[PDB]
Design a protein around this ligand. Structure first.
Ligand SMILES: Cc1cn([C@H]2C[C@H](O)[C@@H](COP(=O)(O)OP(=O)(O)O[C@H]3O[C@H](C)[C@H](O)[C@H](N)[C@H]3O)O2)c(=O)[nH]c1=O
Ligand SMILES: Cc1cn([C@H]2C[C@H](O)[C@@H](COP(=O)(O)OP(=O)(O)O[C@H]3O[C@H](C)[C@H](O)[C@H](N)[C@H]3O)O2)c(=O)[nH]c1=O
Ligand SMILES: Cc1cn([C@H]2C[C@H](O)[C@@H](COP(=O)(O)OP(=O)(O)O[C@H]3O[C@H](C)[C@H](O)[C@H](N)[C@H]3O)O2)c(=O)[nH]c1=O
Ligand SMILES: Cc1cn([C@H]2C[C@H](O)[C@@H](COP(=O)(O)OP(=O)(O)O[C@H]3O[C@H](C)[C@H](O)[C@H](N)[C@H]3O)O2)c(=O)[nH]c1=O
Ligand SMILES: Nc1nc(=O)c2c([nH]1)NC[C@@H](CNc1ccc(C(=O)N[C@@H](CCC(=O)O)C(=O)O)cc1)N2C=O
Ligand SMILES: Nc1nc(=O)c2c([nH]1)NC[C@@H](CNc1ccc(C(=O)N[C@@H](CCC(=O)O)C(=O)O)cc1)N2C=O
Ligand code: NA
Ligand code: NA
Ligand code: NA
Lengths: 398, 398
């Protein structure tokens, strides 16, 4: 007979809540949404939409203060919570850093900017201050030297979810231990510290710092870094050192811009993502591999959620998908409605007549049991459509 | 052999002294910095040293035309162009552990960033800023309480020994170069801190604020100010005010308590002038009440008078025992190299009270030390004709 208030947004609020509904069947859940939650799924799920679709009441923070015998759990929530205004003190938060480092804002960029190898997530209490409350549990996170602010954000979402999950019984049962945050090594960045409205690359810096500025600001659904009009998608460092003033453009071609820094010259790769996506329809390994500078651009997505594997799978392109997957791409990658590669390869199989591919993708680890966000498998869509031919063929693989 | 020393302060002077002693036959040419006044201050004037010792002072343009010489820059202020020499025996001491902290304000930035360590590096002068290949380096530990001035002093001392330990290899071409790493390379230009408009930022953690204080505590240039009131360090409390960061919570004659992003901070108002005045005659009990930050006891006025020196000159033995216990140097010098023993002897001379000498001798007072004129205390006594004092001091000398 418990109550929990979940205040926040995105896949973390969604996936924690999914877990609570399945695992704590009889808990009453109340939700608070963030101001900019459009109730529509984008590269993150809408928490508002999830709650509507799954009969979770949506309340105000004002209304939530007046609840008794409820845990409060903030998951990338956007409004200051004032502990005094509840009748208890069971107020909790996931913050996307290894506290007490990187309190405050832009924790997907700042660590990268500062040349960190690691970050973390932290479960702690909400007290009056900004990420000041006592720590309950933490998990260290490795940042690979190629990963972007988006890859890091995605690790935070994943690990933050898991961490809430490994501790939520102890929050609900008051069975948890806390410890006050240390003084030493504490750091905080306000909203002022980056003006995302007015981004500017600083070339009076080292190659390392410049590469890290690129990584820090590479989060496509918001922005890419820009050099004199042109969008950039990562870069590299050369062994040469230009005598030219830092910022000086040494070379330009259609794929890359080379620039002088405080030490080593840096190559900045022009963003060719749309172009790589058009090509993924029918071109082959050779041609695509010739288009690619930063390997990770194969895992990027447009506003619909379409990655290269997805567009390829939708157009038949079997030899590409094999190579994409050898490059580390996900054979069961999904768009922003939960739609899987398998489901894309369906529309082709249907429109072509050629089912000789399907076993190829199965060897590669394709999974037919997967459902989208309306709980529908590929088998459900085929049944619905009347394509018992295609249906029965596919059922053979089970 | 021949050598060109280009730079300023005790590092230039003391490297040069070592060469005059231990490499008699090398010819030495000197380049001075543009703000070397010729008058010794908290750092010696290299200019003065050179004029006093008949070392010729030349320009960088003249330096380029000297073959048969290696070039060694020591906190030098002018851009060196390697293509204008007819050789490549060009070396620098930079005050950081490269490839980190290239560029400016190296006694400030590492402290600002919460570093536990820094270093000094010996490397080649290349076309860029602090970019040339490394020859040798040494780690420096930054103690938690040390200020920017303390770290500068460590840089000067350690930079000096790094040169001394390597200079034969430089002169003999037995040294080994290795190009700087890309990874972890950092750089701070002159625009990163504006010493004309220093403001403390209280939208930061208590750690970050104490480190702001440390970083800006370099008395010869400035102290940090809160409301035009000079501050000499501070401490963190265990309370955390709800008030907005920067809200002053408590004032008194001695300190100012402020809200930060996490824990409250005490800023100590600077009272060094008052402390130095009181050391003439007051006892340890009175000075103890006056002290907040213990390191204020090692500070100096424009003459180079520290507490221990003022106490010596007034025969304040009881206070000297305490200061030493506190960490003060028993052989502390003013900016003319005049030692505590030289000041004590003036007190013994005027007063006729000699009893205190043994105590100071037992605390490690060193009577062999020379000032920047190569005079010992005994040379002063022989010149004044004071034999009885000479003999007495000599009798207690260990
Ligand atoms: C606003 C913005 C964000 N980003 C990136 C960097 C951020 O780490 C990431 C997420 O942005 P965000 O607006 O969610 O804000 P963050 O600063 O990441 O998180 C703060 O704001 C949240 C609502 C939470 O209260 C969180 N506890 C706060 O630390 O998106 C951009 O690349 N461009 C942008 O223009
Ligand atoms: C990948 C891809 C998709 N499309 C199409 C297919 C869709 O009708 C439309 C929007 O795609 P979407 O990712 O929003 O797909 P969804 O609406 O998520 O999934 C539907 O379309 C799939 C192909 C299956 O039919 C599935 N069972 C449907 O529920 O654009 C292209 O035109 N070019 C493409 O390269
Ligand atoms: C100028 C200035 C310096 N300082 C401190 C911080 C500095 O690290 C330290 C020394 O000052 P400085 O003018 O020598 O400048 P730094 O920036 O330390 O050294 C640079 O300039 C030198 C001439 C050398 O070329 C060196 N390689 C450079 O990095 O004193 C202040 O506290 N207030 C000040 O206004
Ligand atoms: C320390 C101190 C000094 N004075 C006076 C005495 C000094 O001669 C004068 C200048 O101080 P200073 O540190 O510039 O002295 P210096 O010129 O460095 O040294 C001279 O005076 C000393 C007392 C020694 O006898 C030494 N042998 C002399 O060379 O100020 C007063 N009150 C004081 O507290
Ligand atoms: N007490 C409290 N502290 C926090 O750090 C925190 C919460 N509540 N709730 C959600 C989110 C809110 N963060 C902020 C930070 C600054 C402003 C502001 O300057 N106006 C607003 C909201 N947050 C933690 O993420
Ligand atoms: N080539 C070279 N690089 C250096 O880093 C260097 C020297 N020379 N000589 C002395 C000092 C000078 N540093 C600087 C750095 C930047 C500006 C500027 O562009 N403004 C001027 C002087 N210095 C190294 O200490
Ligand atoms: Na360059
Ligand atoms: Na400046
Ligand atoms: Na506060």
């Amino acid at each position: 007979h418990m109550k929990i208030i979940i205040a926040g947004k995105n896949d973390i609020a969604v996936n924690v809540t999914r877990w609570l509904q399945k695992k704590k069947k009889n808990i009453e859940i109340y939700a608070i949404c963030n101001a900019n939650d459009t109730g529509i799924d984008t590269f993150q799920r809408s928490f508002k939409k999830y709650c509507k679709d799954n009969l979770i009441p949506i309340i105000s923070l004002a209304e939530a203060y007046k609840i008794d015998d409820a845990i409060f759990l903030s998951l990338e929530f956007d409004k200051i919570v004032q502990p005094s205004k509840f009748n208890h003190n069971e107020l909790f938060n996931i913050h996307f850093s290894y506290l007490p480092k990187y309190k405050g804002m832009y924790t997907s960029a700042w660590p990268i900017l500062n040349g960190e190898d690691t970050s973390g997530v932290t479960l702690h209490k909400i007290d009056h201050g900004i990420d000041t409350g006592a720590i309950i549990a933490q998990k260290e996170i490795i940042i690979q030297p190629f990963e972007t602010a988006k890859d890091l954000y995605e690790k935070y979402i994943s690990e933050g979810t898991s961490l809430v999950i490994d501790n939520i019984s102890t929050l609900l049962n008051s069975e948890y231990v806390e410890k006050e945050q240390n003084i030493k090594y504490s750091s905080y960045y306000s909203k002022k510290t980056i003006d995302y409205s007015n981004l500017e690359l600083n070339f009076s810096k080292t190659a390392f710092e410049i590469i890290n500025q690129l990584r820090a600001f590479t989060f496509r659904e918001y922005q890419l870094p820009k050099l004199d009009g042109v969008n950039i998608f990562l870069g590299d460092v050369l062994s040469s050192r230009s005598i030219m003033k830092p910022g000086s453009i040494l070379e330009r071609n259609d794929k890359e811009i080379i620039v002088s820094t405080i030490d080593y010259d840096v190559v900045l790769y022009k963003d060719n993502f749309k172009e790589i996506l058009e090509a993924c329809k029918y071109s082959d390994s050779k041609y695509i591999a010739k288009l690619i500078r930063a390997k990770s651009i194969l895992f990027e997505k447009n506003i619909y959620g379409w990655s290269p594997v997805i567009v390829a799978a939708y157009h038949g392109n079997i030899e590409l998908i094999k190579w994409l997957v050898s490059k580390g791409a996900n054979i069961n990658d999904r768009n922003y409605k939960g739609t899987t590669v398998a489901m894309y390869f369906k529309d082709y199989m249907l429109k072509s007549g050629d089912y000789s591919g399907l076993k190829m993708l199965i060897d590669l680890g394709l999974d037919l049991t997967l459902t989208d966000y309306k709980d529908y498998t590929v088998f459900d869509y085929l049944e619905k459509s009347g394509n018992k031919n295609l249906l029965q063929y596919m059922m053979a693989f089970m």
